[PDB]
Amino acid sequence: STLIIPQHYLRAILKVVSSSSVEVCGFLFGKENRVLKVRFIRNRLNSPVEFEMDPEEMLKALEEAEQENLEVVGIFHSHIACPPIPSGKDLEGMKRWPVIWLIVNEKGEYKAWILNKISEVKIVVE
């Protein structure tokens, strides 16, 4: 498993994360394992230790991707301070949404994960 993401999209995510006091989250839209569009979604928990997508904004984003013939390649979110490795609650979310999970933090670290076996996904930056 690999995740192919354009450099400028990953840098844009990292830049938002570097300025956020709460966990950030959103969708990686595209095709196969290739990211073609990034969509931030509001973290309705407003929290530095967990996230939950605003459901109305989530549905709107999914509708817009469908209109554009895009699929959900992944879910991305950030951690504050701690490493980009799934938490226990993250693993529960990966079972609900078994796509690629990209995790980043404010130190510029990034790793990707996919599902009862969890494996790291190699990130290919383009």
> Which residues line the annotated binding site for Zn(2+)?
77, 79, 90
Name which of residues 62 to 81 contact a second copy (CB under 8 A). 81
Question: Rounded to an integer, what distance in angstroms lies between the CA atom of residue 12 and that of residue 45?
Answer: 22
Q: By rule CB under 8 A, what count of residues binds a second copy?
A: 15
Distance in angstroms (rounded) separating the CA atoms of residues 73 and 31: 6
The pair phi, psi for residue 60, each rounded to 5°, is: -60, -45
Q: Is 100 an interacting residue with respect to a second copy (CB under 8 A)?
A: no
Q: Considering the rule CB under 5 A, would residue 53 count as an interface residue with Cl ion?
A: yes
Q: At its nearest, how many Å lie between a second copy and the CB of residue 50?
A: 8
Q: State the minimum distance, in angstroms, from the CB of residue 111 to a second copy.
A: 11
